[PDB]
Every structure is written in C-alpha cells, then in structure tokens.
Amino acid sequence: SSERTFIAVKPDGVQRGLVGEIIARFERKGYKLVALKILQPTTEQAQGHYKDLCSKPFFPALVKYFSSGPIVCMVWEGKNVVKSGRVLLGADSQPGTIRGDFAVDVGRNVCHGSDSVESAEREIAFWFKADEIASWTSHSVSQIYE
Amino acid sequence: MSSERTFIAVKPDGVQRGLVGEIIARFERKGYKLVALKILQPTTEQAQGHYKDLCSKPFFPALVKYFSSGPIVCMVWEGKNVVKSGRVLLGSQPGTIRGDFAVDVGRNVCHGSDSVESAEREIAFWFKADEIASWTSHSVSQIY
Amino acid sequence: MSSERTFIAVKPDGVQRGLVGEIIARFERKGYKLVALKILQPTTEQAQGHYKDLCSKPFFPALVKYFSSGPIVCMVWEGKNVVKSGRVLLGSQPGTIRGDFAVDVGRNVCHGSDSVESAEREIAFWFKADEIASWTSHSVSQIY
Amino acid sequence: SSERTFIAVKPDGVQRGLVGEIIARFERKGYKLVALKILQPTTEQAQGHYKDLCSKPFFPALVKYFSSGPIVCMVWEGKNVVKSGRVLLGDSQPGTIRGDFAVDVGRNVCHGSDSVESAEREIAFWFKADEIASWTSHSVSQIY
Amino acid sequence: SSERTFIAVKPDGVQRGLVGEIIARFERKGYKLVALKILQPTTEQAQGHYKDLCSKPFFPALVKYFSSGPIVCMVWEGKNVVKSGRVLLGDSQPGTIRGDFAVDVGRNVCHGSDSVESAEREIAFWFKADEIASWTSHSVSQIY
Amino acid sequence: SSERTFIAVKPDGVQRGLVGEIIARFERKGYKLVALKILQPTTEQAQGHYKDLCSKPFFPALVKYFSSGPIVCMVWEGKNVVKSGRVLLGADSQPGTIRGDFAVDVGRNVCHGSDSVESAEREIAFWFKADEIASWTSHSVSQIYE
C-alpha cells in the first residue's frame, strides 16, 4: 500500500544516459516517485551499500567501481513496488526489461533494485534522510488501485 | 484462418490514463487489421451483460459499474491467431500491456477475448454487423 | 472553453500504414480528451458530402473515391484550443504527424478541422449525438 | 563550457508522469546531469523562485500552483545548455516538451532558466554546492 | 570477446520498414555494428544460406521467399552477441522483434545466427573480409 | 520520382548508437532504402568527400576527423527525398529533427545529407558502385504516392 523500494542507476547506466528511460518506465507502470538524487558514492558509502559482501571475494573492486562515478538514487512507492521493481529491471534478462534492453554483462547491469521489503527500507534509510522523502498525492491513484 | 477475429477493450482506467493509442499501436505494429472501433460509456445493462458469466459472484456488482463508471474503447482485430496474439500482447512481464502499465488485477488496463468462442460472443455483443468494416490491407502479403 | 471540440480523421493511407494508434497516442499525450471514435469505409455519398465544398473542383471525383477506397478512422477530441492544437499536431516539419510520416499532399495521412466552424460541421456530419461520449477525466485539473 | 541551466518539472508534469521523458530528452541531446532532487515547494520557496514576477497580477496564481505539489529540480551541464534547454521545452511546436504535452501556459509542464544569469540564480536558490555532482561523460568527445 | 553474429532483416521486415528499429535495438543493447549492406538474394544465394535445411520440405518456400526481395545483412560484435542476438529476436514474447512485429513463422521479420559456428559460416558467406569494419566503441568500458 | 539522396551517419553518430534511429525516421517517413554500408574513410576518401573545402581553412582537421572512425553510408529513394532528407536532419536545429534531438555542436552534428540533386548523385557515385545499389518495389508505394 505505502510500500517503498529503493532503485539506483549504476555508473554505467548514468554514463550511458539511461536515467530518464528507467524513471519513465516506473512512471508509466503507475508507481509514485517519492525520493530522488544524484551523487558519486564515497568509498565508505560504496562499502556500506555492499557491506553484505565484505566477506565475499573481490569486494574492493566492487567498492571502487561503485564509487568511480555518479549514481542516481530513487525511492518509489506503491503496491508490490519491490517485487514489480525487480521485474521491471529483469534478471538471461528478457527484452522489455531494463537489463533485457540495455545490459550485456553482470558487472555492467545498469541498475539495482532492492530484493525485498527488508532490503528496501535498509537501503532507503542508508541513502536518504527522512526530509529528503517527499509525501504526495498521485491524482491517478484510484485509477491504478482498487 | 486469416479471418479469425478477437475482441479488445480498453478499460476505463486505460482510457483515463491515455493508453488507447498505445494499445492500438501495439496491435498495428504486430501486423493485425483493425475492423471495428468505438468508444462509449457502458450502461449498467451493457456492463452486466458483458460480465454475464460472473453474475453469481460476490464482486459482480462492484465489477459491473466500475466498468460503467467511465468510457471504454471497443475494438475488433482480424488476422491469423489474433485471439491468442491478443492475449499474449496483453500479458505479467514487461513488453506486454499489463506488464508495462498495470499494477492491480482490478485495474488491469485492458481486456482481450480468451478464446475464439468468447471472441464471437463479445464481438456480436458489442458490435452490430454494419459496424464491422471489412477491407484488405496492402501489407497482407508482407505479414501472412 | 474546455468544451471546444475538433474532428480528426485518419485517412485510408494512414489506416493502411498502421498510424492510427500513433496519432491517437499523440493527442492523448497532449492532454486532450477522446469523446468519439469509429472506423468505417466511406461510401461515395459520404465522401462527396464530406468534401461538399470541393464539388466544383476538377480533382473532386479523384479525391472522392480515394477517400472511399478504404477505411478511415473518425475521431472527436475535446478540450481548450483543441481545433488549433489539432492542426498544429498534424503539420511540414518533423515532430508533427505529416512531418514525420507523409510525403505527398494527396497522401497526407490525416485530416483535422481548420476551424471551430468547420469542426461543428464535420462532427455533426460523421457522428450522431448518441455516438459522442461525454465524461470527465481525472487529469483535467492537471492539464487545464 | 561547463555552462549550467536549471530545469524543474512543474507539479502537472510530475503528476502526469513526465519526469523520465524529460530527463531522457536532455540525456539524448547529450547534456550532463549534475544535480537532481524532488520536493514540494513551500509558499516561501515559490515566491522566491518567481521573484522577478512579483509585480505581475498572475504572480499569486503562479505561487500557489508551484507550491501545490512536488517538483523535480535538475541541473544540466554543457555547451549552450541554457539555450538548448529552452529550445527543448518550446506557440510551442510538436517535438518539444510543451509542444508535445501541454495546452495552457499556466500548466506548461516544465521550467528552464531563461538566461545564464537566471540559471546561476535559480541553481543557487534551489541547490547547495554539496548537492552538485562533478563528473566527466565518457561520451564527451563524441558530443563536443 | 570480439564474438560476432550475423543478422539479416528478411524481405518482410525491409518492406514493413523495420530495419532501423532492429538496428536500434542492437545498438541500445550495447553491441557494435561492424558490417552492413542491402541486397536482393539470388536463388543461388538463398539456397546456400539455407544449406542446412535443404532436406526439409519447406526448404523451397524458404528459398523463394528469401530471394523474393531485398534483405539487410548485418554483423554485430561483442560478448554473447550470438545468444543475445537470438534473445532479442525471440512462441515469441512481446519486447522482442518477432514478439512485437511478426505473426507467422514463415514471415518472422528477421534472422540471427543460431550458433557461433553458424555465425562464422553465415558471415563468411555474405561478407568479404574487406567489408568488415574494425573499430572500438568509446562506450566499451561502460558496457563490458 | 526516382529521385535519390545520399545520407551518412558521421563517426559521432555511429559511436553514440544513432544509426538505427536515423534509418527508422527515414523509413517511417515513407522513403525507400536502396543502398547501405559501413566503413571507416581513408584519408583520400575523406578528402574527396570534402574536396570543395580544399581551399577552406582547417581542411586537414576535417579530413582526419571524418577518417577517424566508421561512418554509415545510405542512399534513399523517393519524391523530394533530397529536400525532405535535409528537413529530417535539421539545421538552431529544432526538436523532432535528428540534430534537434541529438546534436549540440556543428563539429559534432551526427549526420550529413546531400544539399541538392546535384550533390546527391556526386556523393552517391563517389561512395557506391552501381552494383551496390538495390532496385526494388515498396509494397506501400501507392499509399505514399498518388
């Protein structure tokens, strides 16, 4: 209902000019944008985001890639937005999805979306302050929802 | 076989959100032929009759004037395996209409006939014979 | 003022080339409201009557059954300055319908009313009152 | 140079789901996104933004509309970004943002700085230095 | 690696104006165009192209159709270009080329190599070494 | 009627992946593709194409830019195709046109089209052999033409 998910355009996605395309696909799907910003992660921000991988191999490489350039951070609100968000991104990813259309390699997969409600609020709280999150009314809300 | 027809309707939410042209465009690019088209706000009786098969369900009244709460766009498309292709185009995974544009089952933007059986019914229900234009498109030998 | 209406028709070449959905989509995205819609193959008399003002020109017969040579899609759109906006959308420089899709004046894909005067005529000609759906879209206070 | 312009999607544009489309058109043009955020302006912010128009009779309406809902604030960097930004927005012609999506001047979907002067003002008003990303596009020698 | 696949727009795809759309989808995916040409295959060329299917009863029809009009021959370079090419073409699902534009298997708009093996065969058959461009995309380290 | 024009995607246009977009816009306009190829111009090809500028300043720079990477050569056939081609490309170029949508600088204007029937056949004969030009029937020809 008031469910939220975190979406980020990775540096390859920003550099290739795919920011607008991604935002548009979420909008046309009927979801509500409530937070948005662009920034180049510091080493520690990159580390924190990928903290779960601190025991995983090549973590420094991941950290220095993610911090090598600007990302676009988003929060989207709506029913099943976490699940639909992953679906919109894709995986073997299929055309019609973001990765299906624009990405070839896993290391260059354009974008990230939270894999769960668990993960989303963690990622959201990490990247955004409460005041950065807009609260507003979609005029189309009951044409999208029952 | 290329005389097969399917019924497609853009639901009030689909009309409201301006997705009529997009949907029509997706059928045209697929290579199908438009033979009937109209917009109307369904009456209660039209809404009931269309959903005649659901008249015993508890959500029938809710479904009935949602459907008559605003305009729908009615279409008939003609071509080989158009009934199935219609369902495929609707979706749900991205690339399809519902996959691209819809979130809720009660708000799934669009409807398509689920079978040739249903297709003949729905078309006959919403359109009279004189409303169905029959014509031959010049790309027929490029598509089929 | 937001009750202004214009008449738009996709010509047989436009239908033939699958540009109906695209054209409808361009009007929707502009923020205009679809209130009437139908497809038909014009009869000779319908073609003559529509082009009544051109009945004294040497190319009238040629123009008349080209127009009845195949199906057209008839539309009515409602909204502020829609007559003018319709002409603007049609075009010719790129970004407009004729600018994007057309090469020949005799094959200019689409027609729009050139004035409010003409608009009332064309709509009344092609559509009866019961065919015009009147409804209020939820984005009306976002567009106007 | 590293010229910058301020672009804001007004509340109707956000509500109508036009943010991504607009961002895309700037990206496709080859300009560089260096700042981005979404917020609902306070009355005080809207007045400050429209400072130059405070003696105009339609100033109050501008203030209530701009503060009536969320906007998306952007800064774009590149040669002629101020002028090209204005050109992209668009008496607007199809192909442009207002040409494609807007009908009335009070709901013209989007705003861009009218000058470099206005740009630095607008940028300084809406963004702190810390919010502006500095980076180099890999495509820079393909664009300039 | 510098893996290559052969892509051909079949005569219906060319006739239906789908060449640019297809080329675009490969470009948007991040693959590199290294060879490109348009020609109408001779009967002898079509037979050679469909060499592996010469024992199939629908082989003759394939030969006459493929030689019935102009095709666009392409070579694309990049990692998994053979598989991704097949995935992009598409029981085909919307979002794919055949899913979006084709209805029947005999007029499925486009062809892609089914394997690296087939790719080198197809490439060597249709193109001379002199026709293949060698170049580096500036976006290569953004894609791979 | 059987008028032809020469269209080339410049190296910036190829590199930015705008080849398909340009071809599509000509196709949707209703014009007929009759010749197509991709190549990186040699110095002499670049020189010959810009021969009219041999007395013009900075000619070597133009020559080494044009020969610095691959271009896509096209020939399109149809009524007023030379004039319509320039219109589709644009100039101060307006949105809806190729340059209006994708180009910022004159030195990076994505694409070239012949400025006259004069120029078109010169450019065509220069870049294409007779056998490279396909002769074929658009099935939509009389839906486009009277």
Coordinates of N, CA, C and O in Angstrom, one line a residue, chain E residues 6-129:
Chain E
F6 N 25.7 -13.0 -37.2 CA 25.1 -12.5 -38.4 C 23.6 -12.2 -38.2 O 22.9 -13.0 -37.7
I7 N 23.2 -11.0 -38.6 CA 21.8 -10.6 -38.5 C 21.3 -10.2 -39.9 O 22.0 -9.4 -40.5
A8 N 20.2 -10.7 -40.3 CA 19.6 -10.3 -41.6 C 18.1 -9.9 -41.4 O 17.4 -10.7 -40.8
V9 N 17.8 -8.7 -41.9 CA 16.3 -8.4 -41.9 C 15.8 -9.0 -43.2 O 16.2 -8.7 -44.3
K10 N 14.8 -9.9 -43.0 CA 14.2 -10.6 -44.1 C 13.3 -9.7 -45.0 O 13.1 -8.5 -44.5
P11 N 12.9 -10.1 -46.2 CA 12.2 -9.2 -47.0 C 10.9 -8.5 -46.4 O 10.7 -7.3 -46.8
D12 N 10.2 -9.2 -45.6 CA 9.0 -8.5 -45.0 C 9.4 -7.4 -44.0 O 8.8 -6.4 -44.0
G13 N 10.5 -7.6 -43.3 CA 11.0 -6.6 -42.4 C 11.4 -5.4 -43.1 O 11.2 -4.3 -42.6
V14 N 12.1 -5.5 -44.2 CA 12.5 -4.4 -45.0 C 11.3 -3.7 -45.6 O 11.2 -2.4 -45.4
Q15 N 10.4 -4.4 -46.2 CA 9.2 -3.9 -46.8 C 8.3 -3.2 -45.8 O 7.6 -2.2 -46.1
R16 N 8.3 -3.6 -44.5 CA 7.5 -3.1 -43.5 C 8.2 -2.0 -42.7 O 7.7 -1.4 -41.8
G17 N 9.4 -1.6 -43.1 CA 10.2 -0.5 -42.6 C 10.7 -0.8 -41.2 O 10.6 0.1 -40.3
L18 N 11.2 -2.0 -40.9 CA 11.6 -2.4 -39.6 C 13.1 -2.5 -39.5 O 13.6 -3.0 -38.5
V19 N 13.9 -2.0 -40.5 CA 15.3 -2.1 -40.4 C 16.0 -1.3 -39.3 O 16.7 -1.8 -38.5
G20 N 15.6 0.0 -39.3 CA 16.2 0.9 -38.3 C 15.8 0.5 -36.9 O 16.6 0.6 -36.0
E21 N 14.6 0.1 -36.7 CA 14.1 -0.3 -35.4 C 15.0 -1.5 -34.9 O 15.4 -1.4 -33.7
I22 N 15.2 -2.4 -35.7 CA 16.1 -3.6 -35.4 C 17.5 -3.2 -35.1 O 18.1 -3.6 -34.1
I23 N 18.1 -2.4 -36.0 CA 19.4 -1.9 -35.8 C 19.5 -1.2 -34.4 O 20.5 -1.3 -33.7
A24 N 18.5 -0.4 -34.1 CA 18.5 0.4 -32.9 C 18.5 -0.5 -31.6 O 19.2 -0.2 -30.7
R25 N 17.8 -1.6 -31.7 CA 17.7 -2.4 -30.5 C 19.0 -3.1 -30.2 O 19.3 -3.3 -29.1
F26 N 19.7 -3.4 -31.3 CA 21.1 -3.9 -31.1 C 22.0 -2.8 -30.6 O 22.9 -3.1 -29.7
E27 N 21.9 -1.6 -31.1 CA 22.7 -0.5 -30.6 C 22.4 -0.2 -29.1 O 23.3 -0.1 -28.3
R28 N 21.1 -0.2 -28.8 CA 20.7 0.1 -27.4 C 21.2 -1.0 -26.4 O 21.4 -0.7 -25.3
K29 N 21.3 -2.2 -26.9 CA 21.8 -3.3 -26.1 C 23.3 -3.2 -25.8 O 23.8 -3.7 -24.9
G30 N 24.0 -2.4 -26.7 CA 25.4 -2.1 -26.5 C 26.3 -2.8 -27.4 O 27.5 -2.8 -27.2
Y31 N 25.8 -3.5 -28.4 CA 26.6 -4.2 -29.4 C 27.1 -3.3 -30.5 O 26.5 -2.3 -30.8
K32 N 28.1 -3.7 -31.2 CA 28.9 -2.9 -32.1 C 28.7 -3.4 -33.6 O 28.9 -4.5 -33.9
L33 N 28.2 -2.5 -34.4 CA 28.0 -2.7 -35.8 C 29.3 -2.8 -36.5 O 30.0 -1.8 -36.5
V34 N 29.6 -3.9 -37.2 CA 30.9 -4.0 -37.9 C 30.7 -4.3 -39.4 O 31.7 -4.2 -40.1
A35 N 29.5 -4.6 -39.8 CA 29.2 -4.8 -41.2 C 27.8 -4.6 -41.5 O 26.9 -4.9 -40.7
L36 N 27.5 -4.1 -42.7 CA 26.2 -3.6 -43.1 C 26.0 -3.5 -44.6 O 26.9 -2.9 -45.3
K37 N 25.0 -4.1 -45.2 CA 24.6 -3.9 -46.6 C 23.2 -4.4 -46.9 O 22.6 -5.3 -46.3
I38 N 22.7 -3.9 -48.0 CA 21.4 -4.3 -48.5 C 21.4 -4.9 -49.9 O 22.1 -4.3 -50.8
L39 N 20.7 -6.0 -50.1 CA 20.7 -6.6 -51.4 C 19.6 -7.6 -51.6 O 19.0 -8.1 -50.6
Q40 N 19.2 -7.9 -52.8 CA 18.2 -8.9 -53.1 C 18.9 -10.2 -53.4 O 19.6 -10.3 -54.5
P41 N 18.7 -11.2 -52.6 CA 19.4 -12.5 -52.8 C 19.0 -13.2 -54.1 O 17.8 -13.2 -54.4
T42 N 20.0 -13.8 -54.8 CA 19.6 -14.6 -55.9 C 19.1 -16.0 -55.3 O 19.3 -16.2 -54.1
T43 N 18.5 -16.7 -56.2 CA 18.0 -18.1 -55.8 C 19.2 -18.9 -55.2 O 19.1 -19.6 -54.3
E44 N 20.3 -18.7 -55.9 CA 21.5 -19.5 -55.5 C 22.1 -19.1 -54.2 O 22.5 -19.9 -53.4
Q45 N 22.0 -17.8 -53.9 CA 22.4 -17.3 -52.6 C 21.5 -17.8 -51.4 O 22.0 -18.1 -50.4
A46 N 20.2 -17.8 -51.7 CA 19.2 -18.2 -50.7 C 19.4 -19.7 -50.4 O 19.3 -20.1 -49.2
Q47 N 19.6 -20.5 -51.4 CA 19.9 -21.9 -51.2 C 21.1 -22.1 -50.4 O 21.1 -22.9 -49.4
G48 N 22.2 -21.4 -50.7 CA 23.4 -21.5 -50.0 C 23.3 -21.1 -48.5 O 23.8 -21.8 -47.6
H49 N 22.5 -20.0 -48.3 CA 22.2 -19.6 -46.9 C 21.5 -20.6 -46.1 O 21.8 -20.8 -45.0
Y50 N 20.5 -21.2 -46.8 CA 19.7 -22.2 -46.1 C 20.1 -23.6 -46.4 O 19.4 -24.6 -46.4
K51 N 21.4 -23.8 -46.6 CA 22.1 -25.0 -46.9 C 21.7 -26.2 -45.9 O 21.4 -27.3 -46.3
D52 N 21.7 -25.9 -44.6 CA 21.5 -26.9 -43.6 C 20.0 -27.4 -43.6 O 19.7 -28.4 -43.0
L53 N 19.1 -26.7 -44.3 CA 17.7 -27.1 -44.4 C 17.3 -27.6 -45.7 O 16.1 -27.7 -46.0
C54 N 18.3 -28.0 -46.5 CA 18.0 -28.4 -47.9 C 17.2 -29.8 -48.0 O 16.7 -30.1 -49.1
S55 N 17.1 -30.5 -46.9 CA 16.4 -31.8 -46.9 C 15.0 -31.5 -46.3 O 14.2 -32.5 -46.2
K56 N 14.7 -30.3 -45.9 CA 13.4 -30.0 -45.4 C 12.3 -29.7 -46.5 O 12.7 -29.1 -47.5
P57 N 11.1 -30.1 -46.3 CA 10.1 -29.9 -47.3 C 9.7 -28.5 -47.5 O 9.2 -28.1 -48.6
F58 N 9.9 -27.6 -46.5 CA 9.7 -26.2 -46.6 C 10.9 -25.4 -47.1 O 10.9 -24.2 -47.1
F59 N 11.9 -26.1 -47.4 CA 13.1 -25.5 -48.0 C 12.8 -24.7 -49.2 O 13.3 -23.6 -49.4
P60 N 12.1 -25.3 -50.2 CA 11.8 -24.5 -51.4 C 11.2 -23.2 -51.1 O 11.6 -22.2 -51.7
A61 N 10.2 -23.2 -50.3 CA 9.4 -21.9 -49.9 C 10.4 -20.9 -49.3 O 10.3 -19.7 -49.6
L62 N 11.2 -21.4 -48.4 CA 12.2 -20.5 -47.8 C 13.1 -19.8 -48.8 O 13.4 -18.6 -48.7
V63 N 13.5 -20.6 -49.8 CA 14.4 -20.1 -50.9 C 13.7 -19.0 -51.7 O 14.3 -18.0 -52.1
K64 N 12.4 -19.2 -52.0 CA 11.7 -18.3 -52.9 C 11.4 -17.0 -52.1 O 11.4 -15.9 -52.7
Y65 N 11.0 -17.2 -50.9 CA 10.7 -16.0 -50.0 C 11.9 -15.1 -49.8 O 11.9 -13.9 -49.9
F66 N 13.0 -15.8 -49.4 CA 14.3 -15.1 -49.1 C 14.8 -14.4 -50.3 O 15.5 -13.3 -50.2
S67 N 14.6 -14.9 -51.5 CA 15.0 -14.3 -52.7 C 14.0 -13.5 -53.4 O 14.1 -13.1 -54.6
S68 N 12.9 -13.2 -52.7 CA 11.7 -12.5 -53.3 C 11.9 -11.0 -53.2 O 11.1 -10.3 -53.8
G69 N 12.8 -10.6 -52.4 CA 13.0 -9.1 -52.2 C 14.3 -8.8 -51.4 O 15.0 -9.7 -51.0
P70 N 14.6 -7.5 -51.3 CA 15.9 -7.1 -50.6 C 15.9 -7.5 -49.2 O 14.9 -7.4 -48.4
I71 N 17.1 -7.9 -48.7 CA 17.4 -8.1 -47.3 C 18.5 -7.1 -46.8 O 19.3 -6.6 -47.6
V72 N 18.6 -6.9 -45.5 CA 19.7 -6.1 -45.0 C 20.6 -7.0 -44.2 O 20.1 -7.6 -43.2
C73 N 21.8 -7.1 -44.6 CA 22.8 -8.0 -43.9 C 23.6 -7.2 -42.9 O 24.0 -6.1 -43.2
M74 N 23.8 -7.8 -41.7 CA 24.5 -7.1 -40.7 C 25.4 -8.0 -39.9 O 25.2 -9.2 -39.8
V75 N 26.5 -7.5 -39.4 CA 27.3 -8.2 -38.5 C 27.5 -7.4 -37.2 O 27.8 -6.2 -37.3
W76 N 27.3 -8.0 -36.1 CA 27.4 -7.3 -34.8 C 28.5 -8.0 -33.9 O 28.6 -9.2 -34.0
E77 N 29.2 -7.1 -33.2 CA 30.4 -7.7 -32.4 C 30.2 -7.4 -31.0 O 29.8 -6.3 -30.6
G78 N 30.5 -8.4 -30.1 CA 30.5 -8.2 -28.7 C 30.3 -9.5 -28.0 O 30.0 -10.5 -28.6
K79 N 30.5 -9.5 -26.6 CA 30.3 -10.6 -25.8 C 28.9 -11.2 -25.8 O 27.9 -10.4 -25.7
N80 N 28.8 -12.5 -26.0 CA 27.5 -13.2 -26.1 C 26.6 -12.6 -27.2 O 25.3 -12.7 -27.1
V81 N 27.2 -12.0 -28.3 CA 26.4 -11.4 -29.3 C 25.5 -12.4 -30.1 O 24.4 -12.1 -30.5
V82 N 26.0 -13.6 -30.2 CA 25.2 -14.7 -30.8 C 24.0 -15.0 -30.1 O 22.9 -15.1 -30.6
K83 N 24.1 -15.3 -28.8 CA 23.0 -15.6 -27.9 C 22.0 -14.4 -27.7 O 20.8 -14.6 -27.8
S84 N 22.6 -13.3 -27.4 CA 21.8 -12.1 -27.2 C 21.1 -11.7 -28.4 O 20.0 -11.1 -28.3
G85 N 21.7 -11.9 -29.6 CA 21.0 -11.6 -30.8 C 19.8 -12.5 -30.9 O 18.7 -12.0 -31.3
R86 N 19.9 -13.8 -30.6 CA 18.8 -14.7 -30.7 C 17.7 -14.3 -29.7 O 16.5 -14.4 -29.9
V87 N 18.1 -13.8 -28.5 CA 17.2 -13.4 -27.4 C 16.4 -12.2 -27.9 O 15.2 -12.1 -27.7
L88 N 17.1 -11.2 -28.5 CA 16.5 -10.0 -29.0 C 15.4 -10.3 -30.1 O 14.4 -9.6 -30.1
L89 N 15.7 -11.3 -30.9 CA 14.7 -11.6 -32.0 C 13.5 -12.3 -31.4 O 12.3 -12.1 -31.8
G90 N 13.7 -13.2 -30.4 CA 12.6 -14.0 -29.9 C 12.4 -15.3 -30.6 O 13.3 -16.1 -30.9
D91 N 5.7 -18.5 -30.4 CA 6.1 -18.6 -29.0 C 7.0 -17.4 -28.6 O 7.6 -17.5 -27.5
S92 N 7.1 -16.4 -29.4 CA 7.9 -15.2 -29.1 C 7.1 -14.3 -28.2 O 5.9 -14.1 -28.4
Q93 N 7.9 -13.7 -27.3 CA 7.2 -12.8 -26.3 C 7.4 -11.3 -26.7 O 8.4 -10.9 -27.3
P94 N 6.4 -10.5 -26.4 CA 6.4 -9.1 -26.7 C 7.7 -8.4 -26.0 O 8.1 -8.9 -24.9
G95 N 8.2 -7.4 -26.6 CA 9.5 -6.9 -26.2 C 10.6 -7.3 -27.2 O 11.6 -6.7 -27.3
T96 N 10.4 -8.5 -27.8 CA 11.3 -9.0 -28.8 C 10.8 -8.6 -30.2 O 9.7 -8.2 -30.4
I97 N 11.7 -8.7 -31.2 CA 11.4 -8.3 -32.6 C 10.2 -9.2 -33.1 O 9.3 -8.6 -33.7
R98 N 10.3 -10.5 -33.1 CA 9.3 -11.3 -33.6 C 8.0 -11.2 -32.7 O 6.9 -11.3 -33.2
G99 N 8.2 -11.0 -31.4 CA 7.1 -10.9 -30.5 C 6.4 -9.6 -30.7 O 5.2 -9.5 -30.5
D100 N 7.1 -8.6 -31.2 CA 6.4 -7.3 -31.4 C 5.8 -7.1 -32.8 O 4.8 -6.4 -33.0
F101 N 6.5 -7.8 -33.8 CA 6.2 -7.4 -35.2 C 5.7 -8.6 -36.1 O 5.2 -8.3 -37.2
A102 N 5.8 -9.8 -35.7 CA 5.6 -11.0 -36.5 C 4.5 -11.9 -36.0 O 4.3 -12.0 -34.8
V103 N 3.8 -12.5 -37.0 CA 2.7 -13.4 -36.6 C 2.9 -14.9 -37.0 O 2.7 -15.8 -36.2
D104 N 3.4 -15.1 -38.2 CA 3.6 -16.4 -38.7 C 5.1 -16.7 -38.9 O 5.9 -15.8 -39.3
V105 N 5.5 -17.9 -38.7 CA 6.9 -18.4 -38.7 C 7.6 -18.2 -40.1 O 8.8 -17.9 -40.1
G106 N 6.8 -18.3 -41.1 CA 7.4 -18.0 -42.5 C 7.7 -16.6 -42.8 O 8.4 -16.3 -43.8
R107 N 7.1 -15.7 -42.0 CA 7.4 -14.3 -42.2 C 7.7 -13.6 -40.8 O 7.0 -12.8 -40.3
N108 N 8.8 -14.1 -40.3 CA 9.3 -13.8 -38.9 C 10.3 -12.6 -38.9 O 11.1 -12.5 -38.0
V109 N 10.2 -11.8 -40.0 CA 10.8 -10.5 -40.0 C 12.3 -10.5 -40.1 O 12.9 -9.8 -40.9
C110 N 13.0 -11.3 -39.3 CA 14.4 -11.2 -39.2 C 15.1 -12.6 -38.9 O 14.5 -13.5 -38.4
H111 N 16.4 -12.7 -39.2 CA 17.2 -13.9 -38.9 C 18.5 -13.6 -38.1 O 19.1 -12.5 -38.4
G112 N 18.8 -14.5 -37.2 CA 20.1 -14.4 -36.5 C 20.8 -15.7 -36.4 O 20.1 -16.8 -36.4
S113 N 22.1 -15.7 -36.4 CA 22.9 -17.0 -36.3 C 22.5 -17.7 -35.1 O 22.3 -17.2 -34.0
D114 N 22.3 -19.1 -35.2 CA 21.8 -19.9 -34.1 C 23.0 -20.4 -33.3 O 22.8 -21.0 -32.2
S115 N 24.2 -20.1 -33.7 CA 25.4 -20.6 -33.0 C 26.6 -19.8 -33.6 O 26.5 -19.1 -34.6
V116 N 27.7 -19.8 -32.8 CA 28.9 -19.2 -33.3 C 29.4 -19.8 -34.6 O 29.8 -19.1 -35.5
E117 N 29.4 -21.2 -34.6 CA 29.6 -22.0 -35.8 C 28.8 -21.4 -37.0 O 29.4 -21.0 -38.0
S118 N 27.5 -21.3 -36.9 CA 26.6 -20.8 -37.9 C 27.0 -19.4 -38.3 O 27.0 -19.0 -39.4
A119 N 27.3 -18.7 -37.2 CA 27.7 -17.3 -37.4 C 28.9 -17.1 -38.3 O 28.8 -16.3 -39.3
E120 N 30.0 -17.8 -38.1 CA 31.2 -17.7 -38.9 C 30.9 -18.2 -40.3 O 31.4 -17.6 -41.3
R121 N 30.0 -19.2 -40.5 CA 29.6 -19.6 -41.8 C 28.8 -18.5 -42.5 O 29.2 -18.1 -43.6
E122 N 27.8 -18.0 -41.8 CA 26.9 -17.0 -42.4 C 27.7 -15.8 -42.8 O 27.5 -15.2 -43.8
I123 N 28.6 -15.3 -41.9 CA 29.4 -14.1 -42.1 C 30.3 -14.3 -43.3 O 30.4 -13.4 -44.1
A124 N 31.0 -15.5 -43.4 CA 31.9 -15.7 -44.5 C 31.1 -15.8 -45.8 O 31.7 -15.4 -46.9
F125 N 29.9 -16.4 -45.8 CA 29.1 -16.5 -47.0 C 28.6 -15.1 -47.5 O 28.7 -14.9 -48.8
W126 N 28.2 -14.2 -46.7 CA 27.6 -13.0 -47.1 C 28.6 -11.8 -47.2 O 28.3 -10.9 -48.0
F127 N 29.7 -11.9 -46.5 CA 30.6 -10.8 -46.5 C 32.0 -11.2 -46.8 O 32.5 -12.3 -46.4
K128 N 32.7 -10.3 -47.5 CA 34.1 -10.5 -47.7 C 34.9 -9.8 -46.6 O 34.3 -9.0 -45.9
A129 N 36.1 -10.2 -46.3 CA 36.9 -9.6 -45.2 C 36.9 -8.1 -45.3 O 36.9 -7.4 -44.3

